[PDB]
Write a protein that binds this ligand. Structure first.
Ligand SMILES: O=S(=O)(O)O[C@H]1[C@@H](O)[C@@H](CO)O[C@@H](O[C@H]2[C@H](O)[C@@H](O)[C@H](O)O[C@@H]2CO)[C@@H]1O
Ligand SMILES: O=S(=O)(O)O[C@H]1[C@@H](O)[C@@H](CO)O[C@@H](O[C@H]2[C@H](O)[C@@H](O)[C@H](O)O[C@@H]2CO)[C@@H]1O
Lengths: 160, 160
């Protein structure tokens, strides 16, 4: 009845507090104005996108590792070790059909997180930790990020 | 469970067939890489965005008229006159907080269409005609469109 759109500019190395939290049924899309599939090696993550809970837990962690040619999805409670991680091989293969820019979409299916790169679904992630997303972060390895220094994020909340 | 993201490049003067139709609960966002709030007068519409049914009906018509400083929302069946139109005054006032670009979002609330410009909801439109959206069009008055010649459209379907 009263859905909402919120726009955020996220500089590399930062985290932003969402004006409106993301919960079951809502969406989050990240827009990158550049694509560098051959920029270098990450220590270990070239670029990471994170969905965080109000408690500081990493609901969803998305990491792109060029040197290891893989994409990692994991979670963890604050001050706790990294949990069971799911990985997807072939980075470039996922960005086929980009052309100087990319977008990553995350659907919050309540009990799962659907991750989409452009138009291709790369994985149906099962939530290891539950809860609403209240902040987002974009971290990088200095100079080897595969996305622009500033990444735009649009959230669609108050849906279903 | 299996939502989908589809990306389209819509050149001014064209209409594109959606690979995935837009129905109750789905979303459509238009991205413009430019904003010209002082480009000229439309004959009468400077730029119009349309959601069309498989039968050619204009489910939702969105028109920006600089000379008349208003935004019109209407509908109509094919080969029929224009129906009851809703208008919103003050064009620029809606794009406050743009900065060289804009985005228009349309939420299909089943019995209504919620139109958002950037983060501001401009109107809750009551459907005069129902049905799923199968194609979209971007029409302009030669040389006086307030959006870029090519407008990007992203649809989020198969949601609720
Ligand atoms: O920047 S970090 O968040 O600290 O990077 C860590 C994360 O990317 C997690 C993701 O689960 O992985 C850590 O590396 C793991 C590696 O994926 C795993 O294969 C290996 O067995 O253990 C490493 C250390 O936990 C990143 O360091
Ligand atoms: O390019 S058109 O689609 O033919 O432009 C028409 C539309 O913008 C409709 C929107 O309902 O309006 C038409 O003009 C109206 C005008 O807004 C209204 O005030 C007057 O009563 O009737 C006109 C003709 O229906 C546009 O021509």
């Amino acid at each position: 009845t009263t859905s909402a759109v919120n726009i955020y500019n996220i500089s590399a190395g930062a985290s932003v507090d969402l004006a409106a939290p993301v919960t079951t049924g809502d969406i989050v899309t990240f827009f990158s104005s550049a694509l560098n599939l051959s920029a270098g090696a990450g220590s270990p993550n070239n670029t990471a996108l994170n969905l965080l809970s109000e408690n500081g837990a990493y609901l969803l962690h998305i990491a792109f590792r060029l040197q290891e040619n893989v994409i990692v999805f994991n979670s963890r409670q604050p001050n706790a070790p990294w949990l069971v991680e799911q990985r997807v091989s072939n980075v470039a293969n996922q960005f086929i059909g980009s052309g100087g820019k990319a977008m990553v979409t995350v659907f919050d299916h309540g009990d799962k997180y659907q991750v989409v790169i452009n138009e291709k679904t790369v994985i149906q992630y099962t939530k290891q930790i539950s809860g609403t997303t209240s902040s987002l972060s974009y971290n990088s390895t200095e100079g080897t990020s595969i996305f622009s220094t500033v990444v735009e994020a649009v959230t669609y909340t108050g849906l279903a």
